[PDB]
């Protein structure tokens, strides 16, 4: 448990040091892909429950 | 609204995050 904690604390600091491992273009690709899929299905977003949803 | 901008980040990591996530 202590060894895995020392590994996790090391890899999180390595992520904070080396920056994000994802590029911007792949993020734009998956974002526009999700946009095209959700606009293809006419998905209505989940609203916040205002005062009394009665469920 | 008013995007998240994780507690954490250093200077250059904030710069890279603002570059690739905006």
């Amino acid at each position: 448990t202590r060894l895995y904690l020392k590994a996790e604390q090391e890899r999180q600091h390595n992520y904070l040091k080396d920056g994000p491992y994802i590029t911007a273009e792949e993020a734009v690709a998956v974002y526009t892909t999700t946009v095209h899929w959700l606009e293809s299905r006419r998905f209505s977003p989940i609203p916040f429950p205002p005062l009394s949803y009665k469920h | 609204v008013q995007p998240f901008h994780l507690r954490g980040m250093s200077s250059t990591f904030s710069q890279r995050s603002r570059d690739i996530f905006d």
Binding site: P20, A27, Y31, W37, P45 | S17, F21
Partner: protein
């Protein structure tokens, strides 16, 4: 129950249009695989941007904000910034939506 899933998968393999005919050199391929390190390689900012399309933005900020917290084991404290906290309550949603984003990459939009 998952054995019913196996039974319906076998029935779906059986009920295709001429699935076992190999007189003209056709082939059947069965791929099975696992997404390696699916739980540890979710960036939280990308998760928030993909999560703001389906819910209210305060809900997505609450779902992203819980993942950025300090994990403790009896002497050891470290903050979490990469990968989701898999033991949350609502985390069962997060794996099932993010993996949906994988289906648009593997299967393609048309199929």
């Amino acid at each position: 129950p998952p054995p019913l899933l196996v039974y319906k998968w076998c029935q779906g393999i059986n009920n295709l249009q001429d699935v076992w005919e190999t007189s003209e050199g056709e082939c059947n391929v069965m791929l099975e695989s696992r997404f390696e390190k699916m739980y540890e390689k979710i960036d939280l900012t990308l998760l928030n941007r993909l999560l703001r399309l389906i819910v209210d933005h305060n809900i997505a900020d609450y779902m992203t904000a819980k993942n950025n917290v300090v994990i403790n084991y009896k002497d050891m404290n470290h903050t979490n910034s990469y990968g989701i906290i898999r033991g949350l309550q609502f985390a069962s949603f997060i794996v099932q939506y993010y993996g949906l984003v994988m289906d648009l990459l593997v299967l393609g939009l048309h199929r």
